[PDB]
Design a protein around this nucleic acid. Structure first.
Length: 210
DNA sequence: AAAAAAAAAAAAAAAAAAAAAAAAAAAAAAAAAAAACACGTGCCTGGAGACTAGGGAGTAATCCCCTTGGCGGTTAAAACGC
């Protein structure tokens, strides 16, 4: 009961993580997007109690299409509460492979001391965190969520020059939004929202991450 | 006829339900500093190996002294009763 449900939720979480990596412009193959539950059972195992697969066994490294040295790690700790010891273990793994992006998927909780740790290690390495309950549902696949596109700084400058817009008088989106966490949006970026309009067909808006 | 005390008129003064946001108290886990039986390490004094040689214990023979065994005579000690 626990093994089958754990394997099912691990496969669903891995599929959600792979779709998140595909949505962020990273080098993602089609078979990992279309990995079935039986494919996950054959590749990794079906009994998570006896380490088949282990929580550290499933570790995902993905690369970017344009810049191959820009890569992301995905970490699955087994413990419910995350201390600074395992964060420092991931960090000591993280400098020795010369990569600036990783996401740790917590299970139960992750301490405010480690919150402050992730705050003050931020402008060298990006170490995002995610809850296991939030990664059982793809956010962008919902019918209430329109299309979100991350936009570069040159197109942002073109948007500011075309409409005579300033950044403080733009439409805003909080940095703690689940959509912004899904795309990994930082403060100062502008996301483009394409939605269906019943009076014009489709509409495009621009939101500032704050 | 003038001075003092009590009575009364006139004038000033105090006296309804609901919801969001913030402050606060009890609690509670996470993380960073001083103790403490036994472990790490080096030294040495006592434990261990070998040879000699001797003196204290085992073995053989004897005996006689001490120990065991029986049989009988009152008889004081024991047993029974009130």
């Amino acid at each position: 009961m626990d093994d089958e449900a754990e394997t099912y939720k691990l496969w669903r979480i891995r599929k959600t993580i792979m779709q998140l990596s595909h949505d962020r412009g990273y080098l993602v193959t089609q078979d990992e997007l279309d990995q079935t539950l039986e494919q996950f059972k054959e590749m990794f195992g079906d009994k998570p109690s006896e380490k088949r697969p282990a929580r550290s066994d499933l570790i995902v490294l993905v690369a970017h299409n344009d810049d191959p040295t820009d890569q992301m790690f995905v970490f699955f700790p087994e413990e419910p509460k995350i201390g600074i010891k395992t964060i420092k273990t991931y960090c000591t793994r993280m400098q020795e492979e010369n990569i600036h992006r990783a996401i740790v998927v917590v299970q139960g909780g992750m301490t405010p001391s480690a919150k402050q740790s992730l705050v003050d290690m931020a402008p060298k390495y990006i170490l995002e965190q995610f809850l296991e309950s939030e990664l059982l549902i793809n956010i962008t696949e919902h019918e209430l969520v329109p299309e979100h596109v991350v936009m570069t700084v040159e197109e942002k400058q073109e948007l500011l020059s075309r409409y005579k817009l300033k950044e403080n008088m733009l439409m805003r989106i909080q940095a703690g939004d689940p959509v912004a966490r899904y795309f990994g949006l930082k403060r100062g970026q502008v996301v483009k929202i394409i939605r269906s309009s019943e009076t014009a067909g489709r509409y495009i808006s621009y939101r500032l991450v704050c």
